[PDB]
Amino acid sequence: MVPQYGYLTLNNGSQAVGRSSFYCLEYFPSQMLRTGNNFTFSYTFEDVPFHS
Amino acid sequence: GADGVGNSSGNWHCDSTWMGDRVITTSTRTWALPTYNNHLYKQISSQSGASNDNHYFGYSTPWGYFDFNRFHCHFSPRDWQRLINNNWGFRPKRLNFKLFNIQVKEVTQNDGTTTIANNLTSTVQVFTDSEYQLPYVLGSAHQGCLPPFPADVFMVPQYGYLTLNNGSQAVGRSSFYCLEYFPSQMLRTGNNFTFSYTFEDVPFHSSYAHSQSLDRLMNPLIDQYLYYLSRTNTPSGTTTQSRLQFSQAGASDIRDQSRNWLPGPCYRQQRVSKTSADNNNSEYSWTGATKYHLNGRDSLVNPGPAMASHKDDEEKFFPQSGVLIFGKQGSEKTNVDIEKVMITDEEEIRTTNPVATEQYGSVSTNLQRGNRQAATADVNTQGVLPGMVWQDRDVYLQGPIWAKIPHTDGHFHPSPLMGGFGLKHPPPQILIKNTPVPANPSTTFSAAKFASFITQYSTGQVSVEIEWELQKENSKRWNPEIQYTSNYNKSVNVDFTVDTNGVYSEPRPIGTRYLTRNL
Amino acid sequence: GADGVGNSSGNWHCDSTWMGDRVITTSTRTWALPTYNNHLYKQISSQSGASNDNHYFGYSTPWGYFDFNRFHCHFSPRDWQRLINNNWGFRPKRLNFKLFNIQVKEVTQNDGTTTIANNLTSTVQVFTDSEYQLPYVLGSAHQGCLPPFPADVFMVPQYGYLTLNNGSQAVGRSSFYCLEYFPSQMLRTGNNFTFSYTFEDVPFHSSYAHSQSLDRLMNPLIDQYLYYLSRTNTPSGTTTQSRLQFSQAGASDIRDQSRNWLPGPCYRQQRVSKTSADNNNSEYSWTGATKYHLNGRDSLVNPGPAMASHKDDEEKFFPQSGVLIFGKQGSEKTNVDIEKVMITDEEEIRTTNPVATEQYGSVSTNLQRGNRQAATADVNTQGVLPGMVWQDRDVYLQGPIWAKIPHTDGHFHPSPLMGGFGLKHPPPQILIKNTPVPANPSTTFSAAKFASFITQYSTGQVSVEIEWELQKENSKRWNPEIQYTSNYNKSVNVDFTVDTNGVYSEPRPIGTRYLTRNL
Amino acid sequence: WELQKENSKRWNPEIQYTSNYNKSVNVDFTVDTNGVYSEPRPIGTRYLTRNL
Amino acid sequence: GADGVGNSSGNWHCDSTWMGDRVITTSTRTWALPTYNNHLYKQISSQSGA
């Protein structure tokens, strides 16, 4: 099962602080896939030390 | 090739063509694949107190597989007759495998009613290993091969394998293979699957029987120039003194003639008669059987080395395990009577091979001397010696086509025991699976694995095309041969034909040795 | 290459490089060569009343020779681990041999003092036969090989050979070889010797063990289509009448399933236990041993054909002669206790090969009939039959690398018995000798041969470089393998390491079979 | 993934990760009779030895 | 470089030069090497009740 997405922000007690941010995920460009479409991307790791 | 939902992905090809060097057999069947083990691997092992010989440890898999390894898949009884009557030898060359017209069906069982509906977006995933990285099941003479008669629809068998065991417990060297871990083509409705394969060079199978035997390979008219001991003692007329004498062997005594070759090797069998009165009354099925011993467990040697089943006019008797035994149509699995089985008969090999139920020969036990009489012993098992010749077991009609030589430091004369072609790289396995479709996950997240799936199965057609190479018969024999003939007399049913109920049946085993070559 | 007195003739090369197709092992040692037999040939023969089996006739020679034929010469315990863990097979390709930094020393023993001085003008003469014109000693597992640990200096062994004999007396066909009679390079201080050699094409050694056994090569889920006799008689309830019945073999009875292959050949052994209480109390070392017989003399078959040493959970027992037995560091020649020797164990071959201490199987003795019960016999020795597969014996770490196939009309499966690579043209022998230097001849002429020589010996370095080809392991096994691991627990001494006195030692035999292939 | 190969002159053998040779009811890292995959122990990546 | 028995294989260089960006120091010494442990490896460890 694919897990649900949620995040935390600033708080005082359980009350929010004016700096706490709200992100609407509907607000980003997203590919819409019907049956018979596929999704791809590739990624290149930045140079990092070997693990020992 | 990817077509729509409404286009047909491939045509039906079932055919046989003969170019006179080559015959190309094609066959197409309809298959139905269920979901095995509820989409999950399991380990299986010998049940409880099963005997030491019967212990096993292995895994069962969700995957099915296709096996065309039986001859009658490819040949019709008439096609088999052109080959058997007209040819000395044949071997396969290259084959081709094609899957098409796949369709996946979801079934919904509610109350007593079950509705079966097309699931258009579901997939089926198929791969052929071709690097031989899996336990190779084929060649063990399992059921589940394509049916003999093209109008039949067959269920695709489940795939499982065995590994090392101690008792029913596993050993650290036992391997676990996850079939999900190989690259596999995923086929939706409107996709097809193909591959082709080329058989490595292999000796022809010999479809001929010899017109001479090793014992009798010489001119009866002319004497040899080589002496043997004709007699060992001469009478003085009061007593027989010891005087050893020699003779040239000739037509008078054939058995004494110097011979340049030896019969094939033997591993002896117990003889049982088809007439129920002649057999002993005791349980010797096991205690009397001939066996081999590995790692403290005995195993019946059912096929045995290739041997003649009986001598002249013994047709009643047959070796205990030493023959292949096929069941007649509609025969139960267990404890089935002699009338139901079809017992094959190897007697065409009498010439070069020993009778399976009798000893290779006799051998001197001791060193004679004036005061002690010479003695001999019987050799019931003979390994290969230099100058031995033998014939391989016959393939018949419904026997297996090939087998995979195990990969080992050494092996002698790779030809398999059940008959057929030993192949170091046999035709690869084709494994097929219904891709799991989950059913209605919960709204809250759970990290557990799904126990709920849509119940579904798939179906389609499968097409196998093999190209065979033929060895033509060129012989100067004057008189007619022996041919395979369907009897001329009238009958209720025709042989190799459906009955009034629609049940196809094969009346008798058809083995491939008729035409005669001189030795 | 000819240098001065002060130039060095060659560098020390001891190295291992891995190109991932190939590994190239180099090793350099320091040798010391004395003068054997006072510069003269001798004949040697069995002493006096030695038993008929022990008679021999041969010659001892002044010449020494070099043998690198043991693996641990070339591989370090860590280098041996990269190969053993990561690879299915390996074979040698080409090798190179180089001698350098030779120096000859004359020793003068006067009173108790012995002064050792350089003799600059003396020579050492070396030749490699390479036409195989000498008795080939190597491959008999003699001592005198390059030491395992590179800091050791070793004495070069004396060369001698055996020929035909009757008793201790020679036969007219026995050959005498004079090693002075071959072309040989003479090396003074500042000369070096080289040659290179290319191994003929040879099968890889199999460093893998099987994850299946011949007994269990089939799908447990699916029944066979081949019947066997399940039972031979049926009850009438007053008595059991004789009625023979058939069954298809399946998961329920595995032992009855038709199998397409047979285990390897056996020549039976006597079983002895490492626990001193279980063994019988009698002298059966010889009278009970398994032997072969040539020309009226028995010979113990120590190596035997390759066989599993014991069945499941038998690890206590081992075959009488059937295994290779190595001594621990600092073990005496004779009558040494079980704790001193290191006994190798072949159990990784259980799958394809019979247990050395038990019989191949059972065979029907007689023809049954209504009035006589069937009987069977045990086969304690089995020659090769068609359709048999087997594994070759394992090479270990300190076992020999190769052997020379004798040149004969025929031979079967040339792989040697001690393990290693059968080579029709093995690496040639390198023989080395101190050239004789006479001492102060008399002023008057005498035609007699010199009995007086300068006492001297030589020393230098020897360098052997072998190139090995590797067969990489590509397998889909999901779960981890078995690897060779040095134990993690603390210890007084580290394994494969010098002790506080400087004595290198090898704790256990390391055989090359870990990675697992499916059969 | 990019790999850093081990080149070392150590004479004696290393320590390796080995599945135990003894018999067992279930094989490690394998499904059981019910089809439940399991991981018997954590496998950490440090075995081969470098000198400091 | 490989010389005879009588040729000298190298000269004595002991020097210091200063180029004012760089200084190049050279030093030559005479060494004497014995044979240690009688030509053989040993293991050593803390003594007893240390």
- Helix (H), strand (E) at residue C423: strand C421-423
- Report the gap between the CA of D2 and the closest CA in chain A (Å): 9
Q: What are phi and psi of B214, to 5 degrees?
A: -60, -35
Residue type, C484: Y
List of residues 6+ apart from B384 with CB closer than 8 A: B265, B412, C383, C384, C385, C386
Taking Cα atoms as reference points, which of C369, C439, C378, C428 lies closest to residue C404?
C428
Q: How far is B445 from chain A (nearest CA, A)?
A: 6
> Least CA distance to D19: which residue of chain C?
C482
**Which of these, C491, C379, C406, C396, lies nearest to C140 by C-alpha position?**
C406
DSSP C239-257: SEE---EEEE--SS-STTS
Nearest CA in chain A to B445: A3
> Rounded distance, CA C76 to CA D12, Å?
7
Which residues in A lie closer than 8 A to residue B446 (C-beta atoms)?
1
Phi/psi zone of residue C254: left (φ > 0), alpha (ψ -120 to 50 degrees), beta? alpha
CA distance C347 to C344: 9
Residue C416 to residue C303: CA distance in whole angstroms = 10
Q: Closest Cα to residue B107, out of B117, B98, B99, B97?
A: B117
Exposure string of B312-327, with b = 16+ CB inside 10 Å and e = fewer, is eeeeebbbbbbbbbbb
- Give the residue numbers in D contacting B (CB under 8 Å), as ranges: 19-27, 29-35
> DSSP class of residue B39?
G
Cα end-to-end span (Å), chain A: 34
Q: How many CB atoms lie within 10 A of CB B172?
A: 19
Owner of token pair 């069982």: B109
Interface residues on B facing D, Cβ-Cβ cutoff 8 A: 37-38, 40-45, 59, 166-167, 169-174, 176
B6: phi then psi, degrees, rounded to nearest 5: -95, -15
CA dihedral C14, C18, C22, C27 (to 10 degrees): 10
Residue C406 CA to residue C423 CA, distance in Å, equals 9
H or E element in which residue C86 lies: helix C77-86
Distant-in-sequence, close-in-space partners of B80: CB < 8 Å, separation ≥ 6? B71, B72, B397, B510
Beta strand pairing call for C317-319 and A11-12: unpaired
As a residue count, chain D comes to: 52
Count how many Cα atoms sit within 13 Å of the Cα of residue B111 in the half-sphere of its side chain.
Answer: 2
The whole-angstrom distance between C480's CA and the closest CA on chain D is 6
One-letter identity of residue D18: T
Separation of alpha carbons B325 and B300, rounded Å: 15
Chain C CB contacts of E3 under 8 Å are: 6-7
Q: Which residues in chain A are closer than 8 Å to B442, comparing Cβ atoms?
A: 1
Distance CA C208, CA C516 (A): 5
Strand partners, C342: C326
Q: Which residues of E touch C148 (CB under 8 A)?
A: none
* Cross-chain Cβ contact B43/D26 below 8 Å: yes
Question: Are residues B42 and D27, on separate chains, in Cβ contact within 8 Å?
Answer: no
C113: helix, strand or coil:
strand
Report chain B residues whose CB lies below 8 A from the CB of C358: 293, 296
Method of structure determination: cryo-EM
The residue to which tokens 């010449």 are assigned: C63
Q: How far is CA C482 from the centre of its chain?
A: 25
The token duo for C32 is 């010391």
**In Å, how far is A39's CA from the nearest CA of chain D?**
23
Tell me if C189 sits within 8 A of C102, measured CB to CB: yes
Distance CA B408, CA B415 (A): 15
Q: Which H, E and C letters describe B45-62, residue by residue?
A: ECCCCCCHHHCCEEEEEE
Closest among B25, B195, B138, B194 to B423, alpha carbons compared: B138
Q: How far is A46 from chain B (nearest CA, A)?
A: 29
Distance CA B287, CA C360 (A): 16
Report the phi/psi class of residue B276: left, alpha or beta, with left for phi > 0 and alpha for psi in -120 to 50: alpha
| Chain C residue with minimum CA distance to B50 | C252
Neighbour-count burial for B499-513, b at 16+ CB within 10 Å, e otherwise: eeeeeeebbebbbbb
- Structure tokens, C445: 């002429």
Identify each DSSP E strand in C81-203 by its residue range.
87-110, 113-118, 123-128, 153-155, 158-163, 165-166, 169-170, 185-188, 193-198
Cβ-based neighbours of E44, under 8 Å, separated by 6 or more: C500
Give the C-alpha separation, B193 to B126, whole Å: 8
Question: Are the beta carbons of B176 and D34 separated by less than 8 Å?
Answer: no
Strands B42-45 and C158-163: unpaired
Chain C residues with beta carbon closer than 8 angstroms to that of D29:
478-480
Determine whether the interchain pair B445/A35 forms a contact, defined as Cβ–Cβ distance below 8 Å: no
Among C213, C233, C260, the strongest candidate for a mutation testing the B interface, having the largest count of B CBs within 10 A, is C260
Q: Do C500 and E43 touch (CB under 8 A)?
A: yes
Beta-carbon separation of D31 and B169 below 8 A: no
Residues in a beta bridge with C300: C291
Token pair of B462, please? 């499968």
C393 vs B contacts (CB less than 8 Å) = none
Residue that is written with structure tokens 């919960």 in the block: B442
**Assign residue C350 a region: left if phi > 0, alpha if psi is -120 to 50, beta otherwise?**
alpha
Look up tokens 């090939």; give the residue.
B402
Residue C369, SS3 per DSSP: strand
Q: How far apart are CA C145 and CA E30, in angstroms?
A: 40
Question: C498 by DSSP, 3-state: which?
Answer: coil
What's the CA gap between C415 and B411, in Å, rounded? 12
User: Could you tell me which chains touch chain A, where touching means 3 or more CB pairs under 8 A?
Assistant: B, D
Cα dist. C189→C3, C31, C114 in Å?
8, 15, 23
Nearest-neighbour CA in chain A from B426: distance (Å): 37
Q: Which residues pair with B336 in a beta bridge?
A: C246
